[PDB]
Amino acid sequence: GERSRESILDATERLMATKGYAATSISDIRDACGLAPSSIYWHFGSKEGVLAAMMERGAQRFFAAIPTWDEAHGPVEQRSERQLTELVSLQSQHPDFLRLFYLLSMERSQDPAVAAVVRRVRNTAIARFRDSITHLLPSDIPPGKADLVVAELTAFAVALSDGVYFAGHLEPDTTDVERMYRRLRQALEALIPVLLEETHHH
């Protein structure tokens, strides 16, 4: 099934870019990838399902290009910096999967299969941020306390990172993605002791 699916998604991607969503028909997609409407529906159920799958595939490619903490090479002190430089580079490309993700997340989606796609991509991003953020804390924090601090830091980072995409979309000419992320790293470093102490009100 995989290869047919890839071909459908490639064609729909190019078509939507060209014509927009509304003007792109299943028949246009067939014309471009050589698979009959019957075969397209069999794989994606609907046009909206195709868009959702195109968004997920973009997301998977994005995440695969960012090393997990264990995959990052070089000194363990600089693994955090390697991850971040890959994020910066991918984000500064302004990838279309993100536009699609934010759009689908805000739409009150007609096709009920879209929500699961949105949820999966979102949870992956949160888990990936969590992964790297755990390594910013001192290693002597009791694990439960660390889980709390990391969760909060992770939400802050995910929020800032979401906003960076909007800045790139709406202020493309004045937005330095590398610099925004540097500010995030700096904010996280500062917030760590704050969260450690405020949490001690437990």
Interface with Na ion by CB under 5 A: which range of 20-28, 72-80, 90-98, 184-192? Answer: 90-98
Q: Between 35 and 158, whose beta carbon lies closer to its own copies?
A: 158
What's the CA angle centered on 64, arms 73 and 89, to 5 degrees?
75
With binding defined as CB under 5 A, does residue 168 bind Na ion? no
As measured in angstroms, the least distance from the Cβ of 26 to its own copies is 18
3-class DSSP state for residue 171?
Answer: coil
Q: What is the dihedral of CA 190, 156, 134, 105, to 10 degrees?
A: -160
Question: Which residues of this chain interact with its own copies, rule CB under 8 A?
Answer: 20, 22, 99-100, 102-103, 105-108, 110, 118-119, 122, 126, 152, 155-156, 158-164, 166-167, 169-171, 174-175, 179-180, 183, 186-187, 190-191, 194
With binding defined as CB under 5 A, does residue 62 bind Na ion? no
CA distance 39 to 61: 25
- Sequence-distant (6+) residues with CB within 8 A of 151 are 130
As measured in angstroms, the least distance from the Cβ of 163 to Na ion is 20
Count of C-beta atoms within a 10 Å radius of residue 159: 11
As measured in angstroms, the least distance from the Cβ of 51 to Na ion is 9
Interface with Na ion by CB under 5 A: which range of 2-10, 16-24, 94-102, 139-147? Answer: 94-102
The footprint of Na ion (CB under 5 A) covers 54-55, 58, 97
